[PDB]
């Protein structure tokens, strides 16, 4: 009988432009940077595929809610 | 062990009875800075001493000349016959020159205690000036300073504080009722209930502005009373 209640985590992530300057940060494969033009398309194709960036359901849900 | 302004209230640390008339009253904590407390103490003496002259002048002037209505006594046409309609510009010139000298001397004493005791023109003359704000000497010809000076300082400040409250009562009463202090007192006695603050508070009897020898001077009441 888990009670229905508000549950959050405080300051889960930091607000910084650091990752805005590192394309592909969300994915392990693309984080290394481009070697072929195929990398550029892969960046946009997998940007919103949250379920493949992380295997954590909680992290996926939080991105969906804010998106 | 001295009595305080209210029962069962802790006095501030910096108020330990050194100064006269010390009830440990400082809700805004303006005396926390030791240097600021000295300056505010001087201004309390200035307001206390000027206010006492103000209250005495209004009351005595009312008795001798009931019709002058001190609030309007500043107008040149209301001045005594020798000075009636004197040029206010020249009259102000005397006050500025004379008060600028006297007040700068008092100010320099505060900045550097004991520097301005000696007379500038006639060498040799000096005042004791035992404490700041209490020059003594020529300012105390009768020598009342000798004796229990601490008690006299207490009497001065307590009467001076009462004068400050009393004088601003004269101003607000004149603005609201248009009568001097004694005149308003007589009015209350005649009709205590019909004539009191509950009725007069809503009216301000001061004109918006006056013309003093061709110069327009703005005037105001201390509250937005119904003109």
């Amino acid at each position: 009988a888990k009670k229905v209640k508000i549950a959050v985590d405080r300051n889960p992530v930091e607000t910084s432009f650091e990752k805005w300057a590192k394309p592909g940060h969300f994915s392990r494969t693309l984080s290394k940077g481009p070697n072929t033009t195929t990398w550029i398309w892969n960046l946009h194709a997998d940007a919103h595929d949250f379920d493949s960036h992380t295997s954590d359901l909680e992290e996926i849900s939080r991105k969906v809610f804010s998106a | 062990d001295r009595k305080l302004w209210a029962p069962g209230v802790v006095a501030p640390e910096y108020l330990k009875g050194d100064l006269a008339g010390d009830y440990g009253w400082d809700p805004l904590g303006l005396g926390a800075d030791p240097t600021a407390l000295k300056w505010y103490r001087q201004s309390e003496l200035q307001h206390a001493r000027w206010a006492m002259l103000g209250v005495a002048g209004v009351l005595v002037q009312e008795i001798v000349k009931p019709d002058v209505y001190f609030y309007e006594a500043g107008l040149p046409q209301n001045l005594p016959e020798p000075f009636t309609n004197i040029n206010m510009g020249g009259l102000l010139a005397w006050e500025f020159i004379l008060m600028h000298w006297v007040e700068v001397r008092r100010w320099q004493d505060y900045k550097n205690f004991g520097s301005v005791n000696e007379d500038p023109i006639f060498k040799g003359n000096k005042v004791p000036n035992p404490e700041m704000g209490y020059p003594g000497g020529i300012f105390d010809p009768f020598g009342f300073s000798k004796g229990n000076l601490k008690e006299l300082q207490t009497k001065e400040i307590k009467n001076g504080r009462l004068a400050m409250i009393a004088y601003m009562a004269f101003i607000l009463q004149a603005q609201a009722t248009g009568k001097g202090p004694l005149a308003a007192l007589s009015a209350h006695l005649s009709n205590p209930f019909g004539n009191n603050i509950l009725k007069n508070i809503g009216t301000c009897t001061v004109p918006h502005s006056v013309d003093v020898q061709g110069l327009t001077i703005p005037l105001t009441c201390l509250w937005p009373g119904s003109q």
């Binding site: 910084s16 432009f17 650091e18 805005w20 300057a21 394309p23 | -």
Partner: protein, 40 residues
């Protein structure tokens, strides 16, 4: 601020500013010199 200016240096941001500038220049020229067909 260093990272933010790095973000503005990314290819999509530069292209947007560059073509916004390039387009604006061409649009403004045709506003003051309408209908250019021959150098003359």
């Amino acid at each position: 601020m260093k990272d933010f200016t790095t973000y503005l240096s990314t290819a999509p941001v530069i292209a947007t500013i560059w073509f916004t500038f390039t387009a604006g220049l061409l649009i403004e020229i045709n506003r003051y010199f309408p209908d250019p067909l021959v150098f003359s």
